Amino acid sequence: IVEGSDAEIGMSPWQVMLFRKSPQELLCGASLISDRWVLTAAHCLLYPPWDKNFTENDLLVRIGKHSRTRYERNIEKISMLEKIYIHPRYNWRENLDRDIALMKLKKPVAFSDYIHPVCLPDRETAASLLQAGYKGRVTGWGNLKETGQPSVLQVVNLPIVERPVCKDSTRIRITDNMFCAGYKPDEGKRGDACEGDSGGPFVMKSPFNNRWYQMGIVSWGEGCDRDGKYGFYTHVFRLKKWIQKVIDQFG
Amino acid sequence: DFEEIPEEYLQ
Amino acid sequence: EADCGLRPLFEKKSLEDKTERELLESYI
Ligand SMILES: N[C@H](Cc1ccccc1)C(=O)N1CCC[C@H]1C(=O)NCc1ccncc1
Ligand SMILES: *[C@@H]1O[C@H](CO)[C@@H](O)[C@H](O)[C@H]1NC(C)=O
Ligand code: NA
Ligand code: NA
């Protein structure tokens, strides 16, 4: 996260770290959506241009974390993966359309002060909150700059951007399964996701029921925190029918 | 970099 | 889950985090 700040303790208790076993390193962010299911970006697991194709046994999920590198004894919980599910129409060839994946844990994780699931939006909450100017919050342990790495989880709040501005900022083909967020050059403030933040959540706190909803997944961007560029996020609600299909079939 | 995690999670 | 999106150290104890107000102010 570029131009963010240190998270407060328990600020993002749905935050998940995807952790590579060997070599032991941060792979991606992710989010906890129930005691047995974790949501992330497909490109965190499958991206053939970079020879990335992880299997369940390659990875661990670390939940309840704050420090990036520490083993947070008596706080974090480490889970093994039972199964990975990637969206069947994930477009790794072109533009990361439908950049979404689910991971089922081998065993349920115990909730605590530091571990708690985020809500997924309904049609109404998405329609109400996914509006240009409305801010969400992005969290992760990714790079602090485009070209180092944080001690603890970082957070930044960013406004959703009008679709034509998103489209005009890039040569990549944008789809309805994406939205973009970030400040404009004239808006002064800044901030962005960066490499390592992939798969983490873009969340909004509903002013109607005071619950946090995951509206987006950190997907892609051209550089980090560049003027006139914006971060792109998987549109969770647009892909919710797939999420529900997978959980209903395999849950 | 990363602190070693308990071996139970790598077995 | 019925309890999703309510943080033990914040909403569950009626404490606010340092920047959630910025989000609320944007929801015009
Ligand atoms: N920079 C590429 C742009 C791109 C987008 C879509 C298809 C191909 C290439 C990118 O973000 N990529 C290439 C594959 C993964 C993704 C990435 O690094 N995503 C993390 C990220 C998030 C926000 N800002 C910067 C990077
Ligand atoms: C990724 O890995 C799986 C299994 O190892 C393989 O069958 C698949 O063809 C690979 N490439 C994909 C899914 O694009
Ligand atoms: Na364009
Ligand atoms: Na920017």
Q: Is there a shared CATH topology between the A1-12+118-237 domain and the A13-117+238-251 domain?
A: yes
CA distance A235 to A72: 32
Cβ-based contacts of A21 with chain B (< 8 Å): 10
CATH class for domain C1-28?
few secondary structures
B touches C (3+ CB pairs < 8 Å)?
no
Counting ligands in written order, which one lies closest to the CA of residue A223? 1
Can A99 be counted among the known catalytic residues? yes
Q: Find the closest chain B residue to A57 by CA distance.
A: B10
**Pick from A176, A17, A213: nearest CA to A103:** A17
Write the CATH number of the domain with boundaries A13-117+238-251: 2.40.10.10
Q: Do B9 and A80 touch (CB under 8 A)?
A: yes
**Pick from B3, C6, C13, C2: nearest CA to A14:** C6
Report long-range pairs for A87-95 (Cβ below 8 Å, ≥24 apart): A87/A42, A87/A239, A87/A242, A90/A42, A90/A46, A92/A42, A92/A43, A92/A46, A92/A47, A92/A48, A92/A49, A94/A173, A95/A172, A95/A173, A95/A174, A95/A175
Position A160, amino acid: I
Alpha-carbon torsion (A244, A208, A220, A133), positive or negative: positive
Q: Is the CB of A14 under 6 A from ligand 1?
A: no
The method recorded for this entry reads X-ray
Residues with CB under 6 A from ligand 2: A 46, 48, 53
Three-state SS sequence of A86-100: ECCCCECCCCCECCC
- Candidate list A12, A43, A79, A219, residue with the active-site label: A43
Question: What does chain B come to in residues?
Answer: 11
Q: Do A11 and C17 touch (CB under 8 A)?
A: yes
A-C CB pairs within 8 A amount to 71
Beta bridge pairs of residue A5: A155
Q: Domain locations in chain C?
A: 1-28
Tokens 């960013």, located at residue:
A158
Which pairing describes strands A212-220 and A201-205: parallel, antiparallel, or unpaired? antiparallel
Domain A1-12+118-237, CATH homologous superfamily name and number? Trypsin-like serine proteases (2.40.10.10)
Q: Which two tokens stand for residue A56?
A: 């369940």
- Candidate list A31, A79, A198, A219, residue with the active-site label: A198
CA distance A9 to A31: 16
- Entry resolution in angstroms? 1.3
Q: Domain locations in chain A?
A: 1-12+118-237, 13-117+238-251
Can A197 be counted among the known catalytic residues? no
Counting ligands in written order, which one lies closest to the CA of residue A232? 1
Which ranges constitute the DSSP H helices of chain A? 123-129, 163-168, 240-250
CB within 8 Å of A68: residues ≥ 6 apart: A26, A141, A149, A150, A151, A152, A153
